[PDB]
Amino acid sequence: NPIRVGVIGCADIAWRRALPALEAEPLTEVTAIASRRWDRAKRFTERFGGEPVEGYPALLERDDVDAVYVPLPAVLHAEWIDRALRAGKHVLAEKPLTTDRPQAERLFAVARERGLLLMENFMFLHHPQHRQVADMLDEGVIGEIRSFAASFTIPPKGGALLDIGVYPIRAAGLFLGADLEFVGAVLRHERDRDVVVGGNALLTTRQGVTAQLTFGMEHAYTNNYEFRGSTGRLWMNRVFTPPATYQPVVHIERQDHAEQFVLPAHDQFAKSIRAFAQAVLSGEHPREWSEDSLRQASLVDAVRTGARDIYFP
Ligand SMILES: NC(=O)c1ccc[n+]([C@@H]2O[C@H](COP(=O)([O-])OP(=O)(O)OC[C@H]3O[C@@H](n4cnc5c(N)ncnc54)[C@H](OP(=O)(O)O)[C@@H]3O)[C@@H](O)[C@H]2O)c1
Ligand SMILES: [Cl-]
Ligand SMILES: [Cl-]
Ligand code: NA
């Protein structure tokens, strides 16, 4: 019996990425979608199936919902993940899981007490391309890793740290490992709205492998990462949001020789939704997921707290 999913909040990311995955995935059944406006729920249910539900509490009260997807704004995650878990539902929450480390630990504690899965939906982690890149690095294609950069920036349309910078920060954790420490950062705040619109952070491992992370929403739409090694460099584009049908190309340059490798296309959105569902169905809730989300939340806090904040103009 497929896991019965309800969605709280008719989000952009839900419409574009998560719902088409849920709809297609044999293991998950979209049973209810809730909105602040019934009319919006209904538009979304006409597209993806399910019962349209007015307001979020009524969806949490349903007996045909086993798990809830939470694509709400970052600042509203904690209240609603808390209540979904307390209603006895497993929870697929969009990144960033919540807004700080202490809050993220309380959430996991609530889920833990009840045997429930709480998963942070970094769907990019479920694309095979990063492990293929990591294998090439481990084989020595560019020698020892010296430094890392990653960027995710988009055009003007949480703030740019919580909504966008979490992606390059999470990529640095994936490739550089669990001992990353904050070194310095800048956050640019628009005086007008009081909102972070861009920034750049420097982190380091204890061996001095550095990560420079750029993010923003006042930019052209870029999403890439690059490694500098002792005998070369490796970079790739479309590293956070590759289409399901898109074939990654790994670029390497070393002295007098460059190479590009085309890798298979994969649907990371479907893969993430499927991992979530397999964990719920099997009861095997990987400890690495939650520890990684906690380490993530800490570096994000360390960035917010440590950054030089610059208000313009
Ligand atoms: N769109 C993306 O690709 C993208 C990119 C990076 C990060 N994210 C993350 O995904 C989550 C959702 O982002 P999103 O970009 O998809 O945002 P979005 O389109 O604004 O969707 C958020 C949804 O939450 C609901 N909501 C409840 N209270 C709200 C309020 N006071 N103001 C605005 N919306 C409210 C709305 O649903 P109802 O009106 O139906 O209740 C809205 O559709 C965030 O955690 C964000 O960091 C998304
Ligand atoms: Cl993602
Ligand atoms: Cl390319
Ligand atoms: Na600060």
Given 126, 161, 192, the domain boundary residue is 126
Q: Residue 42 carries which side chain, given as an amino acid letter?
A: K
- The H-or-E segment that residue 124 falls in is none
This entry's atomic model was obtained through X-ray
203 and 101 together in one domain? no
Ligand 1, atom 33, residue with closest C-alpha: 73
> Helix crossing, 77-86 with 101-113: angle to 10°?
10
Handedness of CA 299, 105, 16, 275 (dihedral sign): positive
118 and 135 together in one domain? no
Q: What is the CATH number of the domain that holds 118?
A: 3.40.50.720
87 and 210 together in one domain? no
Structure tokens at 35: 């909105």
Measured from the CB, is residue 40 less than 6 Å from ligand 1? yes
240 and 153 together in one domain? yes
As a whole number of angstroms, the distance between CA 300 and CA 304 comes to: 6
248's CB contacts (< 8 A; 6+ apart) are 127, 129, 132, 236, 238, 242, 262, 263, 265
Ligand 1, atom 47, residue with closest C-alpha: 163
Structure tokens at 86: 């307390």
91 and 18 together in one domain? yes
Distance 304 CA to ligand 4 centre (A): 5
124-to-66, 91, 241, 270 alpha-carbon distances in Å: 24, 18, 7, 11
Q: What are phi and psi of 294, to 5 degrees?
A: -70, -45
Given 126, 146, 168, the domain boundary residue is 126
Instruction: Establish whether 77 is an annotated binding residue.
Output: yes
- Tell me, in Å, the resolution of the deposited structure: 1.9
With CA atoms as reference, report the closest residue to 8 among 75, 58, 43: 58
222's CB contacts (< 8 A; 6+ apart) are 151, 152, 153, 237
78 and 210 together in one domain? no
Number of domains in the chain: 2
Given 91, 126, 161, the domain boundary residue is 126
Structure tokens at 300: 């994000």
As a whole number of angstroms, the distance between CA 283 and CA 279 comes to: 5
With CA atoms as reference, report the closest residue to 94 among 64, 118, 111, 117: 118
Instruction: Give residues whose Cβ lies within 5 Å of ion ligand 3.
Output: 237, 249
164 and 289 together in one domain? yes
Domain holding 52, by residue range, is 1-126
DSSP codes of every residue in 127-166: STHHHHHHHHHHTTTTSSEEEEEEEEE-----HHIIIIIH
112 and 26 together in one domain? yes
